[PDB]
Design a protein around this ligand. Structure first.
Ligand SMILES: O=P(O)(O)O[C@H]1[C@H](O)[C@@H](O)[C@H](O)[C@H](O)[C@@H]1O
Ligand SMILES: O=P(O)(O)O[C@H]1[C@H](O)[C@@H](O)[C@H](O)[C@H](O)[C@@H]1O
Ligand SMILES: O=P(O)(O)O[C@H]1[C@H](O)[C@@H](O)[C@H](O)[C@H](O)[C@@H]1O
Lengths: 108, 106, 107, 108
């Protein structure tokens, strides 16, 4: 089961409506940030959602001392309404910055 | 910064309805994605994404002579063991889809 | 081919005070130079400049050549640490496309 | 120092002329298989060579039970002469197959 993954791992996404974080298993490719319900990379291969990097940017992130959050901004209507913003939370500042920087270089 | 192998329109047959429906498909190293349209800037959410690691391509038309079969090895979008039939515009176009899919799903 | 931008740029030599032209391909990781734009037959970069080791500092203001920008080396690679290479595009508008992408990539 | 890495790790490349293996640190992106002298991802960033995937294929590999080798074939003149073949050796069959399958899906 090869896969052109640039980064993978669990992230929590804040829901503005549910007022809580939903954890998923995320996989970054050159085209999409995909969410899967689980990390079973051999069997769980229908994405919950696929966010097109061509129309997303990463804007802000936590300053080191949770300090492990970043914002993904939508430039066009898709999974996210144009102009709207999703907040992600990683395990640590360092992990967050790995996600942030990898996303940044694919969304310039 | 895209990474796509092939893109274009395909018709997918319904086994039960015995009819074809058309979509815009994008083949990447990981998925066969279907979109409603070819507008990569405004049509951003795949109708479905078929994981290649769970599929094989089995047969195709000989020189419509533009069909090929995608077989599901595991449950996903397609039930395990089932088969979806796609139709391109020409034999030559179909063979481009097939030859890439064959390598990707080996 | 996963690329952000491609096109011809002229690179100035500090000491020779002249420009030389190449075909550049900007990816998330590198600014690559090739001799030509033939991506099927010209396969080996003349040089590959790692973006994580660079920053872009200044660029020309619009004339209203206004098409230059500066790439600064933060570490020793193709360019010695602390040194600067100057590139020239065909227009201010083209230059700003290069600069704006580079600014984001090298932040 | 973010980087669009699909896979990275040490490989040994056989030299037909030196009659020996040369070890390098390899990084696979969607565009190239790069070799670096070392794994210092923060400082060693001039590739020793960059092999364009658009004109390479992977042809054969070892059968399990060294059984950790694969062949990279050149379709065009570049680092390798058109029609010529380079042999790589990984640490294990499993590692080799990870390299082989990741290369295969980027070179169809
Ligand atoms: O959206 P909810 O209600 O889940 O709020 C939380 C946050 O979004 C965090 O920044 C934060 O670190 C918190 O733990 C806080 O609970
Ligand atoms: O071409 P050289 O001389 O480098 O020979 C080697 C091999 O090609 C390997 O299969 C093998 O596992 C060996 O290590 C052997 O040295
Ligand atoms: O430039 P060097 O030789 O240091 O190569 C490294 C990389 O540039 C990384 O993407 C990567 O994740 C590596 O760790 C790899 O060592």
């Amino acid at each position: 089961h090869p896969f052109t993954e640039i980064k993978s791992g669990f992230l929590e996404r804040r829901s503005k409506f549910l007022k809580s974080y939903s954890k998923g298993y995320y996989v970054l490719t050159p085209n999409f940030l995909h969410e899967f319900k689980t990390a079973d990379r051999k069997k769980d291969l229908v994405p919950v959602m696929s966010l097109a990097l061509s129309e997303c940017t990463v804007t802000e992130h936590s300053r080191k001392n949770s300090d492990a959050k970043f914002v993904l901004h939508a430039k066009q209507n898709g999974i996210i309404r144009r102009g709207h913003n999703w907040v992600f939370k990683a395990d640590s500042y360092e992990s967050m910055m790995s996600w942030f920087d990898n996303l940044k270089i694919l969304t310039s």
